[PDB]
Amino acid sequence: AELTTLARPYAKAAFEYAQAHQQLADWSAALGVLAAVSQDDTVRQLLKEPQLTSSAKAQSLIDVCGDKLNAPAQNFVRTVAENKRLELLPTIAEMYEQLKAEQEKSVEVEVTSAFTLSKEQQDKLAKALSARLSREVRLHASEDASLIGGVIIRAGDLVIDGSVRGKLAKLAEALKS
Amino acid sequence: ISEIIKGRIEKLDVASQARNEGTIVSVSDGIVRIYGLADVMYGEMIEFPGGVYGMALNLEQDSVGA
Amino acid sequence: SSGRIVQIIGAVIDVEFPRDAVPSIYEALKVQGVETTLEVQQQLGDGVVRSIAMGSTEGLKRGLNVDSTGAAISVPVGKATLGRIMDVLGNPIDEAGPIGEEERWGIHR
Amino acid sequence: SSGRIVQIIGAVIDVEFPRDAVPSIYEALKVQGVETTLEVQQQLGDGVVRSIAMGSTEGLKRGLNVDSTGAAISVPVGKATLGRIMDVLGNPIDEAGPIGEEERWGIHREAPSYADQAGGNELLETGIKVIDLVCPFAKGGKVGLFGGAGVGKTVNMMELIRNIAIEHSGYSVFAGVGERTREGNDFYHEMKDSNVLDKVALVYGQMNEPPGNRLRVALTGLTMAEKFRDEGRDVLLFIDNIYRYTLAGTEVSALLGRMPSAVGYQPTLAEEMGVLQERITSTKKGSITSIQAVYVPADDLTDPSPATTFAHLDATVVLSRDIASLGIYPAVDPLDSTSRQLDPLVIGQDHYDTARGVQYVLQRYKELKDIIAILGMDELSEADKLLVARARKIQRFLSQPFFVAEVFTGSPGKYVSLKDTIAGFKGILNGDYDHLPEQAFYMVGGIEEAVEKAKK
Ligand SMILES: Nc1ncnc2c1ncn2[C@@H]1O[C@H](COP(=O)(O)OP(=O)(O)O)[C@@H](O)[C@H]1O
Ligand SMILES: [Mg+2]
DSSP, X not given: OOHHHXXXXXXXXXXXXXXXXXXXXXXXXXXXXXXXXXXXXXXHHHTXXXXXXXXXXXXXXXXXXXXXXXXXXXXXXXXXXXXXOGGGHHHHHHHHHHHHHHHHTEEOOEEEESSOOOHHHHHHHHHHHHHHHTSEEOOOOEEOTTSSSOEEEEETTEEEEOOHHHHHHHHHHHHHO | OOHHHHSSGGGSOOOOOXXXXXXXXXXXXXXXXXXXXXXXXXXXXXXXXXXXXEEOOEEXXXXXXX | OEEEEEEEETTEEEEEOOTTXXXXXXXXXXXXXXXXXXXXXXXXXXXXXXXXXXXXXXXXXXXXXXXXOSSOOEEEOSGGGTTOOBOTTSOBOSSSXXXXXXXXXXXXX | OEEEEEEEETTEEEEEOOTTOOOOTTOEEEESSSOOEEEEEEEEETTEEEEEESSXXXXXXXXXXXXXXXXXXXXXXXXGGTTOEEOTTOOBOSSSOOOOOXXXXXXXXOOOOGGGBOOOOOEEOOSOHHHHHHSOEETTOEEEEEEOSSSSHXXXXXXXXXXXXXXXXXXXXXXXXXXXXXXXXXXHHHHHHTTOGGGEEEEEEOTTSOHHHHHHHHHHHHHHHHHHHHTTOEEEEEESOSHHHHHHHHHHHTTTTOOOOGGGOOTTHHHHHHHHHTTSSOBSSOEEEEEEEEEOGGGOTTSHHHHHHGGGOSEEEEBOHHHHTTTOSSOBOTTTOEETTOSHHHHOHHHHHHHHHHHHHHHHHHHHXXXXXXXXXXXXXXXXXXXXXXXXXXXXXXXXXXXXXXXXXXXXXXXXXXXXXXXXXXXXXXXXXXXXOGGGGSSOSSHHHHXXXXXX
């Protein structure tokens, strides 16, 4: 099954507890640290040993993280270990932010221009995108030298392309169809 | 992440296991599942304690079925 | 050592033991509160073994303690068995008292 | 870039590549150190591809580096392939050193378009009485030799090769798919000793080879025939058993993560068959004439594999185990065999009437057989007694001694022309031979040899 399918219950549990106790930022930091630690080659290997018990694996992950996990996050790590799901922590961390973003009414937009970075350009597009989405927008601009001129805006599954390369694609299919 | 989290790991006692050795995980109906035999070739012979020998048939991702 | 019933499905029972005390295949196990006998069929990993009950499982529950006997089901053999009726575990079922056995043999050879 | 083996299970191997360097479907991969080729069949996701080995996996391990070749299996094509024996990868499997190729084609290709098909009814004579009568073949047509185990598929094909390929002025491709290695050796020495090896390309993938080899051998042989067709030439393509291509897909289908369908077959049975069969055709550039032997599991013609094959062929020749069990060869069923050429406009009214006349007598005899078994022969009408005698003569006049079967019978081979066949059957139906015993017609040739045999 899709890692997202297996991680959905755990991510939703973390979010519904975090929201009801005013901890939406503490859990964000804890899940991000747990994901990183588990991905390390030495920790990866330790977590796949037949000699260690579920509690021993869980404990080892809490000691490396330390202060970064609050009491509740420590209990969540044990629950994930007891169920043998410690290979899903990066996915649980990703899905938690998505639930939180819909709650805070925000989107992490991924703008890709043809050789340009400017505050005048960003604030001119961010008001229209914020108005259209009805959410706060966290632009993450980048460079795409591939484009002749223009910009491609990615937000969720929505993709607004206003690049000349897109006009060339349209012109090419029109002639052969 | 932090220099602190980068530390502690050298005191976790993970060590290592030779690529030519592994450990038995389960025993059922003449089939044995082994963890750690990274250098096994399909059809190769595996040596167990007591002079018992096996033949590697399933070289799956994280387990060898002998 | 002593294990805990972790799963029950009909006649089949799973028992968890300490990693240094896991019973071998065909080893006989006894449930502490009912004295029901179990025969180990396979080792599943994590100290867990799967067994078949040598009696009824009605009334058994998860968390009950289980004792490993260190040997397979052993039954009385020789002249003392003649003219007597016995069950699967070698117990007399003819109401004529105990069997005058000199030795017992395991049932797997 | 470079990949690592992550999972070996039988003939199926998974290889993990950088997520920016995932090889294409049907792309060929090479294992480092070991001499093994893997073809990508599926892209599971996360840079991993599922592939099938074109060799053995006994020497393979987890972690071996695999190289992407950027293309599908490329085999040598053209004049350099004539008089040579080759494997699925196109490597020479004869001791005559390397092949001087001037071009390599990819085994995977699209079928010719609907506008490229060509229609022709030129009658091709075979020299066999039963076929020339009820299954007249056509130049550029598709022929299928359907039959179970031990009824004559190889023998009949060898006789055709001899009565057609040897005389054929153009080139020829012979593909041994899931064949016995002994038959391949006998045929190679036969083409070499007959001096005809110079105009025949030989591709062999026998039963001792891994599933992947038996799954692509047919595409290799067909790729060589397509190069010759596209040059404007007339080509002959002989396939020893096309069932082994379907079976290799059944053997590997479950390990590829596909749920099974009816009679434990791959769910892609009809598409995998259509993708191969639509390339074996005669276009407007050149003409491929093809003969395929089709194995019938447990003699059951309703089995999904044989049943899906009939629609792809122009001429369908059916071999019967019940006829072979009576010592009658060729064991062709004249009531189940059929051809698109069996039409009055194409073969003429005399031939067509003689063929339908023979089929009518044999169908009527099939329903009188049970009557004769229970009650007896005297309880039949005078018309039925006469019809039963002629049916038994026609059934024996369809047997024929073959030149490729002299080691099995001890009797010399015979070649009957279409004129002689029609005359012999028209005579038996008319009554011109109601005095000769039924044993005089068994294993003879033309109708004159039955007349000579009767006296002795
Ligand atoms: N035309 C024939 N004449 C004599 N014997 C034949 C003939 N065809 C088949 N046979 C018998 O059967 C064998 C041929 O079977 P084969 O052609 O290999 O069948 P298949 O390919 O259908 O398995 C011969 O060895 C012989 O014993
Ligand atoms: Mg054959």
